[PDB]
Amino acid sequence: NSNICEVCNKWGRLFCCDTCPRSFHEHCHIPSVEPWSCIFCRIKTIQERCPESQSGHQESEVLMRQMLPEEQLKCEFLLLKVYCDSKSCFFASEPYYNREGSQGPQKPMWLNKVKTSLNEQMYTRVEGFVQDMRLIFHNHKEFYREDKFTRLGIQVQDIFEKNFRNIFAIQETS
Numbered sequence: 001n002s003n004i005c006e007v008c009n010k011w012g013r014l015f016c017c018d019t020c021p022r023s024f025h026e027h028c029h030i031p032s033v034e035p036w037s038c039i040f041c042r043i044k045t046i047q048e049r050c051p052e053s054q055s056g057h058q059e060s061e062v063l064m065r066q067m068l069p070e071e072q073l074k075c076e077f078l079l080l081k082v083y084c085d086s087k088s089c090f091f092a093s094e095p096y097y098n099r100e101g102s103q104g105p106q107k108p109m110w111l112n113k114v115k116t117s118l119n120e121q122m123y124t125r126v127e128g129f130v131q132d133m134r135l136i137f138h139n140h141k142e143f144y145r146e147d148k149f150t151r152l153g154i155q156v157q158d159i160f161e162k163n164f165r166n167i168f169a170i171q172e173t174s
């Protein structure tokens with residue numbers, strides 16, 4: 001197994017997957033680490049049991065899906081893919097807003113809040129989770145305006161959207 005956490009790329013107290021070489025800090029894995037198979041492996045198993053699950057889907061259909069166990073897992077995995085990027089640090093904890101010329105967002109949002117919401121089964125459809133995630137980056141874009149720091153929101157949103165399209169097998173388009 002790997003000697004660093006798959007998510008944050010640091011050593012430490014690591015838990016090793018039994019069905020692949022990946023390792024995780026306890027609370028870097030999502031869900032928190034409970035033989036044992038990691039979320040990458042569990043996601044692969046879903047695909048292997050239903051090959052047609054990889055055919056293209058419409059985003060509008062995906063968003064309306066109820067959060068049954070497989071969709072819950074896929075959202076957990078998508079959230080984890082965002083934390084895998086080091087730039088997720090800017091969006092992980094609760095933000096505060098005091099900048100000349102700007103007003104904070106009406107509904108603040110951050111990755112650890114989405115993590116807690118998933119853990120507490122607060123989302124009944126995929127749409128709820130995706131709306132909160134997109135809100136993180138939209139809030140950031142609106143607040144920082146013309147500061148070059150706005151680009152961090154564009155960058156991390158791109159990671160979210162690419163992984164959303166992959167994990168939920170969104171139909172490819174030009």
Ligand SMILES: O=C(Nc1cccnc1)c1ccc(Cl)cc1Cl
Binds near residue numbers: 032115
């Ligand atoms: O962050 C977390 N836990 C943690 C524990 C100890 C050191 N660092 C981080 C955590 C765990 C579970 C959930 Cl649902 C949300 C969070 Cl936000």
Ligand SMILES: [Zn+2]
Binds near residue numbers: 007008024025028
């Ligand atoms: Zn880690």
Ligand SMILES: [Zn+2]
Binds near residue numbers: 019022038041
């Ligand atoms: Zn694994």
